[PDB]
Amino acid sequence: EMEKEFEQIDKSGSWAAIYQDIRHEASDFPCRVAKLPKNKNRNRYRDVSPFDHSRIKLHQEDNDYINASLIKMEEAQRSYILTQGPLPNTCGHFWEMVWEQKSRGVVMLNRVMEKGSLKCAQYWPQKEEKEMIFEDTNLKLTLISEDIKSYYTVRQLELENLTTQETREILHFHYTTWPDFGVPESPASFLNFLFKVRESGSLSPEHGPVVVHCSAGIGRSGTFCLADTCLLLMDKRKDPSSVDIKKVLLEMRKFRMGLIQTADQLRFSYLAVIEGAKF
Ligand SMILES: [Cl-]
Numbered sequence: 001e002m003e004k005e006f007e008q009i010d011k012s013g014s015w016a017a018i019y020q021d022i023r024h025e026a027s028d029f030p031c032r033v034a035k036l037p038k039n040k041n042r043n044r045y046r047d048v049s050p051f052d053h054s055r056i057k058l059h060q061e062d063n064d065y066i067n068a069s070l071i072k073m074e075e076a077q078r079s080y081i082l083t084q085g086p087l088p089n090t091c092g093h094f095w096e097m098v099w100e101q102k103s104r105g106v107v108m109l110n111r112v113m114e115k116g117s118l119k120c121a122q123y124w125p126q127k128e129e130k131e132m133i134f135e136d137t138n139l140k141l142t143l144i145s146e147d148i149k150s151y152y153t154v155r156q157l158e159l160e161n162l163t164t165q166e167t168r169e170i171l172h173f174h175y176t177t178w179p180d181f182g183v184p185e186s187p188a189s190f191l192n193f194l195f196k197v198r199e200s201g202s203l204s205p206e207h208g209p210v211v212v213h214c215s216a217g218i219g220r221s222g223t224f225c226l227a228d229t230c231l232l233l234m235d236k237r238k239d240p241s242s243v244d245i246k247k248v249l250l251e252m253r254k255f256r257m258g259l260i261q262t263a264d265q266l267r268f269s270y271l272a273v274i275e276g277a278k279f
């Protein structure tokens with residue numbers, strides 16, 4: 001069904017058209033907090049801001065602002081936090097958010113440097129013996145171990161609230177092979193990656209929402225949540241063919257602007273849902 005639609009769209013060369021339809025129909029809500037002068041250095045891209053209604057609020061007495069959005073997919077029964085790649089001055093805020101929201105997993109869809117350009121701060125420790133302390137938010141972060149595979153890495157991180165000395169194990173799922181240009185030829189690796197995250201238990205309702213990010217937290221990140229949600233709906237719905245990817249994406253864009261940044265990413269999402277459903 002979705003296969004047929006895909007084939008027709010591919011044949012017609014109309015991905016760019018469908019995508020522009022989505023941009024035109026997308027929700028528009030205020031982002032007043034994100035745009036306050038005092039928050040200028042908390043935003044990686046001035047063009048990418050969380051809506052006020054869905055933004056994640058930090059709990060400590062300071063400025064509560066982080067560029068992150070709660071995407072709550074009611075029918076699919078899953079929530080995600082989408083956020084930008086942390087900046088050098090917001091790494092403490094990032095881990096404060098993970099703590100306060102009770103996240104079990106963090107999903108990273110970029111390399112820290114791509115095409116020789118910085119897309120994200122080095123917000124986790126690369127070496128066991130060199131832990132990170134975030135003094136502003138009073139958190140400690142230690143690399144316990146990592147499982148480096150050919151197309152992704154999973155790291156076992158220990159996050160300690162230095163105030164209470166409570167510790168939590170955070171799983172860091174790092175997809176390291178997203179192409180420098182465009183999207184993956186095949187969704188196979190991306191899909192295997194998604195299934196790994198699912199198998200880990202990180203997406204379970206017993207935990208706080210998974211934190212998903214790329215550089216701006218809308219493009220590859222959008223692809224990840226969109227595919228996951230659509231596959232959920234297909235599995236749950238009485239009539240699995242009734243899942244409309246464009247409608248699902250518009251629903252998600254009620255919670256964060258700009259999800260899926262290109263027609264190629266839209267096409268890739270279709271591809272991934274189709275292939276994933278077969279599995
Ligand atoms: Cl201000």
Ligand SMILES: [Cl-]
Pocket residue numbers: 110111112113
């Ligand atoms: Cl990296």
Ligand SMILES: [Cl-]
Pocket residue numbers: 178179180181
């Ligand atoms: Cl490449």
Ligand SMILES: [Cl-]
Pocket residue numbers: 198203
């Ligand atoms: Cl699942």
Ligand SMILES: [Cl-]
Pocket residue numbers: 109110119214215216219220
């Ligand atoms: Cl990115």
Ligand SMILES: [Cl-]
Pocket residue numbers: 242243244245247248
């Ligand atoms: Cl639908």
Ligand SMILES: [Cl-]
Pocket residue numbers: 023257258259260261
């Ligand atoms: Cl857009």
